Every structure is written in structure tokens, then in C-alpha cells.
């Protein structure tokens, strides 16, 4: 139930030594005071209190993470999961809609189209694609109580190529949650809390090395300037219109073996 | 109630950038894995649900703040509060016993001498000693219920030449809390977790700048190995055993100006 890691004391040793003496190092660069030193433990505390460890971490330092692991690897590129993600989210047939109220039933529709291969670009048999995403109040279910437990998320199972169409509403940018030590922290700096309008994906298959990332959208607001440094090039959508107004896009996913 | 600085949003923009950066720099230095990132953020809640921000920002990051501090001063060297101040100890004639039990009766006693002076010298009328340290357990008063709320704790009134003769217990080293997040931290490492013994303190006159500072005993074990890294070779005392039996050292105190 609870993480575990095979990091041997000598492993943990090298790490700490260098992250304390990084921080005790800016300190010294910026003649920080004691006045400081009282609000920053005041402000770790409050961090804890208000549930906010997995929300700043995943902001301001997850994206390195996924930059180690990114090395590894050759598929499609990945980014952060953030604090939002759900296991075993309801399947869904390759070619479906994931499950909405009435409300989000109002925005313009985005239907999402691709393949899974391998490196060589080969179709992938029993491969699943777990989308979720945030609604265009900038709220996630499981998240905000008066939402559905299951709503914008599901297990796409893939055809015996690979393939999906997923209809699902058009992302749009929000803030992060401002009311607490994290908002306090960026408005005592002059910073913006907002991410990018995204989609979030897991995608999976036999005997291969799956890929948690992000897809993002042309032209969006916030993109340049996202609060939680997640977004790359290679990761932007260009969603072309159709004529009965909804959005289209083509995306493939490509698979490392594990 | 709550801890305040003026701290502006363009100095804490600069401090920030560089502490979130020198982590990041770390995890891309060392290739941390994501098992690793989640055990740091389950370890993180953990020292919040703990009780622990006192204890390990005192531990690890404290003795940088006091670092910086000493640059301005030049009076008798400062050391790191610690998580076990508390103000308003009851006050003591100049020549005075701290309060203890018969228990702490039985350990050999230390009789601590000196002047507060200024920086030339001159001893300084109203001046304080706030004397604070551990029992021979390691335990403070007011941070164990089986304790009296003031044992080793006192405010000693200096008289008018601002001279004091304070006798209390010969101190020991101990061990910091080791069953909580810190105590995990430190074991995964191979560390230990020993500070050696001694006096912490809080000197003050009117219209002085006060010291807060800690002293320590020539030849003790951990000294060259604290946890909290916070000894400094002038601040090592060299008590000598009377025929008595007991511990006997002078120690002038020297603040600047307010
Ligand atoms: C002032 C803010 C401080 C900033 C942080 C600086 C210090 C960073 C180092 C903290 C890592 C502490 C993790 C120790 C927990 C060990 C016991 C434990 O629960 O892990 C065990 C798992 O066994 C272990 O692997 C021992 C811990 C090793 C894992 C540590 C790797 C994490 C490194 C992350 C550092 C990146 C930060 C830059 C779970 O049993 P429950
Ligand atoms: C992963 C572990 C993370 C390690 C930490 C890295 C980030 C370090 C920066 C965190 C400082 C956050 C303090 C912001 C609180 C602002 C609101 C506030 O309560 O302060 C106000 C006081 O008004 C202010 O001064 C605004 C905050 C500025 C003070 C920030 C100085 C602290 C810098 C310490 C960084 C040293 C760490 C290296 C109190 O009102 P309540
Ligand atoms: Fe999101
Ligand atoms: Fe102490």
C-alpha cells in the first residue's frame, strides 16, 4: 500500500548530500533571513495541512522526472501524470464516446483518431488507451463532488490493428487550485496559476512499455507560459474544423518494448 | 500570530527559481526514477503528518540561515535556536541554581561564569541569559509531559556589571527523534543521529543586538559529526573538575549594537 524504491543507502547518501547542500547553497547566494526562515516553515506546514504535497510537486517538479525517464526512451514523447489520474477507469469500445452530463454535451466536440504501433510503426493488438481530462469549469472527477465519478474518463480498448476514435469535448485551459499554499506561493511571486487546455493518456499493450503524457492544442493560451513546465513541440494538436462544427485530429502512439 | 517578512515578489521570483532549479538539477544529475519521486512525496506528507517540519528544517537547513546572519556580526559567534525555545522562562537572580528534580540532582554539576561586555570590552548593566539544554534522558522540559514545565529552563537577571554564576548539570549527548520521518530518513542513508552535548542560550541588553548561540565540551563525542552540523571551534568549552567534584568554566558574552 505504501511506495517503495530499491535505492541502496549509498544511492540515497550521493542524492541527499547534493540536494541539501543545493538548497543550504541558495541561502547563502541570497543572504536569507531568519523573518524568511520562519515563513518558509510555516509555509511547508501549510502545505501539509491543505493536502497540497502531491499538487506542488507535480507542478514544480515533476517535469524533471519525466525528463530522467525520457532518456530510455525512443515512442511517442511522455509528460507529467499530475495528481489527477485514476486505475481502472470503465472500458470502452475502440470507437465510443467517453461518459458526460448534459453540461459538457454543450462544447464543441473533439473526436480523436490514431493507431498504437511499435517502433517500426507495426498495429498493436490488445492495446488500451485511459484518457481523462479536465471538464470546461476546469474541474476532474473524483475531484469535485458534484461531478460523476466517471466523467471525461475511460479504458479505450483498442481493434485488432490498434485503432480508436474517441469523441470526447474540447479542452480548455484552467487554474490550478489558488486557495491555499501553492496560489499563496505564486502570488506573492507575480506568477500565473494556469495550465494549458490538455487532454491526459495512458497507453499500453502486451509486452511493451507503456506511456503516461500530454496532447495540447494550437495556438492555445498558456502554452508558452505553463505553470507546471509539461508541455513540448512534439506534444501540440492541430484539430481541423468539420462542417457539422465539431474538431478533428489524428494521433498515433508509438511503443517501446518493455 | 502568524510569521511575516518583506520579502518582495521580485526577490522571492529570484530565491525561488534558483532553489526549484538546483532540485531539478539534482534529479537530472543523479537520473532519479519514479519509484524514487514516489517515496519522496509519500515521505513528505509523513513528516508533515508527523509533527516533523521543526525538527528537520533545524536538522538540515537551519545552520545556513544562521550562517548568513554571522556575516553582519561581530560579537561572540552564533549557533542555530533549535526547535526547543521558549520565552518567557522565569527569571533568576544573577548567582542561581536552574530549576531540576532529585533525578538530575545526581549528575555532576556544571558551574557556568562570565561578563556580558559590548564590543570593547565594557561589561553592560540589564542584560540577560536565557539558558536552555537537555536532561542527561535527552529530554527537554515542555517536549516530555513527565517533566516539569520549566526544568533546566531559567532567565538569569546578570547584575550591574553584567556578570552571572549559573550552576546546573554537566550536559550529554543525544540522540534527535529517530521514530518518524526523520529517524527513516537518516537510517536509509547509514547516518546517525547524535548531536553532542550542550548549552543552548539567548543573550541580551538594552539597546543590543541579542545572540542566540550554543556551547559545547572539549573532547565530548559527536562534536566533529552533528547531525545539525551547527559546532564551531569557538564555541567549545574546557571545564575544569574542582575538588568538589564539579565542572567549573568561564564564558564572557560580547554583543554589538542594536
Ligand atoms: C527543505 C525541503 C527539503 C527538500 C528535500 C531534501 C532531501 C531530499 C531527500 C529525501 C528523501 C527521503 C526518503 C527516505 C525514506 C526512507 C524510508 C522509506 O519509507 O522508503 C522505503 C523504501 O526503501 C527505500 O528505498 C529507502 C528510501 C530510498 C528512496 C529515496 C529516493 C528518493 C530520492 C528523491 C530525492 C529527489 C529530490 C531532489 C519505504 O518503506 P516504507
Ligand atoms: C520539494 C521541496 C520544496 C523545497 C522548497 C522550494 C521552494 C522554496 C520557496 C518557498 C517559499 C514560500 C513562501 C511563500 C509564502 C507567501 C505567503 C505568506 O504566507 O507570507 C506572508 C508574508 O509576506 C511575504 O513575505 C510573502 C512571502 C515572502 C517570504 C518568502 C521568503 C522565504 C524564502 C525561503 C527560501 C529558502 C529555501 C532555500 C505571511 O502572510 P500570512
Ligand atoms: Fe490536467
Ligand atoms: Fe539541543
Redesign the interface.
Known amino acids: 500500500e ?4 530499491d ?1 541502496s ?8 548530500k ?3 547542500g ?21 509555509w ?2 501549510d ?3 491543505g493536502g497540497e ?2 499538487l506542488f ?1 507535480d507542478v ?6 519525466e ?3 525520457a ?1 530510455s526512451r525512443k515512442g511517442t514523447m511522455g509528460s507529467i501524470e499530475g495528481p489527477y489520474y485514476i486505475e481502472n477507469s470503465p472500458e470502452l469500445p475502440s470507437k465510443c464516446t467517453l461518459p458526460m452530463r448534459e453540461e459538457d454535451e454543450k462544447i464543441t466536440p473533439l473526436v480523436f483518431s490514431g493507431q498504437v504501433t511499435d517502433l517500426d510503426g507495426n498495429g498493436l493488438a490488445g492495446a488500451k488507451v485511459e484518457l481523462w481530462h479536465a471538464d470546461n469549469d476546469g474541474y476532474y472527477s473524483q475531484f469535485a463532488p458534484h461531478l460523476p465519478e466517471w466523467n471525461l474518463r475511460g479504458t479505450i480498448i483498442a481493434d485488432e490493428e490498434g485503432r480508436y476514435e474517441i469523441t470526447t469535448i474540447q479542452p480548455a485551459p484552467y487554474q490550478i487550485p489558488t486557495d491555499g499554499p501553492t496560489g499563496q ?1 505564486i502570488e ?4 500565473h496559476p494556469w495550465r494549458p487546455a490538455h487532454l491526459h493518456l495512458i497507453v499500453s499493450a502486451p509486452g511493451k512499455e507503456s506511456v503516461t503524457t500530454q496532447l495540447y492544442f494550437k495556438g492555445g493560451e498558456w502554452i508558452d507560459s505553463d505553470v507546471a513546465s509539461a508541455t513540448k513541440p512534439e506534444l501540440i494538436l492541430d484539430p481541423k474544423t468539420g462542417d457539422d462544427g465539431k474538431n478533428y485530429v489524428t494521433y498515433n502512439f508509438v511503443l517501446d518494448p518493455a
Open positions: 505504501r511506495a517503495t524504491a535505492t543507502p549509498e544511492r540515497l547518501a550521493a542524492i541527499a547534493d540536494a541539501l543545493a538548497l543550504n547553497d541558495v541561502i547563502l547566494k541570497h543572504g536569507v533571513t531568519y523573518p524568511e526562515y520562519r515563513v518558509f516553515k510555516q511547508l506546514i502545505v501539509g495541512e504535497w502531491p510537486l514544480f517538479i515533476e517535469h524533471s522526472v525528463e530522467v525517464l532518456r506561493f506573492a511571486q507575480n506568477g
